[PDB]
Amino acid sequence: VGLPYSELLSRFFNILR
Amino acid sequence: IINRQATINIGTIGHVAHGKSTVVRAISGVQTVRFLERNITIKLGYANAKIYKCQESFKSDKEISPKCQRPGCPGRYKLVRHVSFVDCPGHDILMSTMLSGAAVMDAALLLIAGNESCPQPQTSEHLAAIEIMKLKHVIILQNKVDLMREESALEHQKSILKFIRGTIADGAPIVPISAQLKYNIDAVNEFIVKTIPVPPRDFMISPRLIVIRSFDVNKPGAEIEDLKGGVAGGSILNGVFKLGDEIEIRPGIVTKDKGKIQCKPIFSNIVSLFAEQNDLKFAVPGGLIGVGTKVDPTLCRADRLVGQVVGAKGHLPNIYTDIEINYFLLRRLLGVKKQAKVRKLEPNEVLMVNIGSTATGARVVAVKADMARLQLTSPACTEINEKIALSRRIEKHWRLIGWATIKK
DSSP B287-332: EEEEEEESS-TTTTSSSS-SSEEEEETT--PEEEEEEEEEEEEEEE
Which residues of B fall within a CB distance of 8 Å from A15? Answer: 183
Q: How many CB atoms lie within 10 A of CB B374?
A: 23
Chain B positions contacting chain A at CB under 8 Å are 145-146, 150, 153-154, 157-158, 161, 171-178, 181, 183-184, 187
Enumerate residues 6+ apart whose C-beta is below 8 A from B314: none
Enumerate residues 6+ apart whose C-beta is below 8 A from B407: B324, B325, B326, B371, B385
Which residue type, as a one-letter code, is found at position B204?
M
At B391, give phi and psi (nearest 5°).
-135, 140
Alpha-carbon distances of B281 from B4, B50, B238, B291, rounded to whole Å: 11, 21, 17, 11
Which residues of B fall within a CB distance of 8 Å from A3? Answer: none
Backbone conformation region of residue B406, classed left if phi is above 0, alpha if psi is from -120 to 50, else beta? beta
Name which of B282, B406, B301, B290 is nearest B356 in CA terms: B406
Q: How many CB atoms lie within 10 A of CB A15?
A: 9
Q: Is B43 helix (H, G, I), strand (E, B) or coil?
A: coil
User: Which of A5, A10, A14, A16 is most worth mutating to test chain B (most B CB atoms within 10 A of its CB)?
Assistant: A5
Which residue type, as a one-letter code, is found at position B148?
M
Tell me if B64 sits within 8 A of B72, measured CB to CB.
Answer: no
DSSP type of residue B356: T
Tell me if B292 sits within 8 A of B211, measured CB to CB.
Answer: no
Q: B157, A11: Cβ pair inside 8 Å? A: no
Name which of B68, B112, B121, B114 is nearest B93 in CA terms: B121
Is B404 annotated among the ligand-binding residues?
A: no
Which residues of A fall within a CB distance of 8 Å from B156? Answer: none
Using a 10 angstrom Cβ sphere, with 0-12 exposed, 13-18 middle and 19 or more buried, the burial of residue B154 is middle
Q: Which residue of B has its CA nearest to A15?
A: B183
Alpha-carbon distances of B167 from B246, B253, B286, B372, B401, rounded to whole Å: 43, 42, 27, 26, 16
Enumerate residues 6+ apart whose C-beta is below 8 A from B324: B371, B373, B374, B406, B407, B408
Name which of B340, B320, B357 is nearest B392 in CA terms: B340
Is B19 annotated among the ligand-binding residues?
A: yes
Tell me if B315 sits within 8 A of B374, measured CB to CB.
Answer: no
Name which of B51, B69, B151, B64 is nearest B107 in CA terms: B51
Is B169 annotated among the ligand-binding residues?
A: no
Q: B153, A11: Cβ pair inside 8 Å? A: no
Nearest-Cα distance to chain A for B344, in Å, is: 38
Which residues of A fall within a CB distance of 8 Å from B177? Answer: 12
Q: Is B271 helix (H, G, I), strand (E, B) or coil?
A: strand
Enumerate residues 6+ apart whose C-beta is below 8 A from B149: none
Which H/E stretch holds residue A13? Answer: helix A5-14
Tell me if B109 sits within 8 A of B102, measured CB to CB.
Answer: no
Give the span between the Cα atoms of B304 and B215, in whole angstroms: 11
**Gaps in chain A (C to N distance exceeding 2.5 A) after:** none
Enumerate residues 6+ apart whose C-beta is below 8 A from B127: B110, B167
Q: For B298, how many CA atoms within 13 A lie in the half-sphere containing its CB? A: 2
Enumerate residues 6+ apart whose C-beta is below 8 A from B335: B92, B121, B122, B124, B125, B399, B400
DSSP type of residue B286: S
Q: Is B381 helix (H, G, I), strand (E, B) or coil?
A: strand
Q: How many CB atoms lie within 10 A of CB B376?
A: 17
Q: A8, B176: Cβ pair inside 8 Å? A: yes
Q: Alpha-carbon torsion B136, B356, B233, B2, what sign?
A: positive
* Angle of the B121-132 helix axis to the B96-104 helix axis, nearest 10: 40
Give the span between the Cα atoms of B320 and B37, in whole angstroms: 32
Which H/E stretch holds residue B2? Answer: none
Which residues of A fall within a CB distance of 8 Å from B175? Answer: 5, 8
Tell me if B63 sits within 8 A of B78, measured CB to CB.
Answer: no
Give the span between the Cα atoms of B294 and B9, in whole angstroms: 26
User: Which of A3, A11, A12, A13 is most worth mutating to test chain B (most B CB atoms within 10 A of its CB)?
Assistant: A12
Q: B157, A5: Cβ pair inside 8 Å? A: yes
Enumerate residues 6+ apart whose C-beta is below 8 A from B366: B347, B372, B373
Considering only the beta carbons, identify the residue of B158, B171, B187 that sits closest to A8. B187
Name which of B197, B205, B267 is nearest B237 in CA terms: B205
Nearest-Cα distance to chain B for A4, in Å, is: 9
Experimental approach taken: cryo-EM
Nearest-Cα distance to chain B for A5, in Å, is: 6
E strand segments, B216-285: 231-238, 241-242, 246-249, 266-274, 282-283
Name which of B201, B172, B155, B207 is nearest B9 in CA terms: B201
* Angle of the B20-27 helix axis to the B185-195 helix axis, nearest 10: 80
Q: Which residue of A has its CA nearest to B148?
A: A13
User: Can you give the resolution of this entry in Å?
Assistant: 4.2
Q: For B162, how many CA atoms within 13 A lie in the half-sphere containing its CB? A: 8
Tell me if B182 sits within 8 A of A16, measured CB to CB.
Answer: no
At B229, give phi and psi (nearest 5°).
-70, 160
Is B143 annotated among the ligand-binding residues?
A: yes
Give the span between the Cα atoms of B278 and B290, in whole angstroms: 12
Is B96 annotated among the ligand-binding residues?
A: no
Characterize B69-88 residue by residue with b for buried, 16 or more Cβ atoms within 10 angstroms of its Cβ, and e for exposed: eebeeeeebeebbbbbbbbb
Considering only the beta carbons, identify the residue of A2, A11, A17 that sits closest to B174. A2
Q: Do the bridges between strand B174-176 and strand B138-142 make them parallel or antiparallel, or are there none, so unpaired?
A: parallel
Q: Which domains does chain B have, with CATH numbers?
A: 5-201 (3.40.50.300), 202-316 (2.40.30.10), 317-408 (2.40.30.10)
Tell me if B329 sits within 8 A of B322, measured CB to CB.
Answer: no
* Angle of the B152-163 helix axis to the A5-14 helix axis, nearest 10: 150
Give the span between the Cα atoms of B372 and B364, in whole angstroms: 7
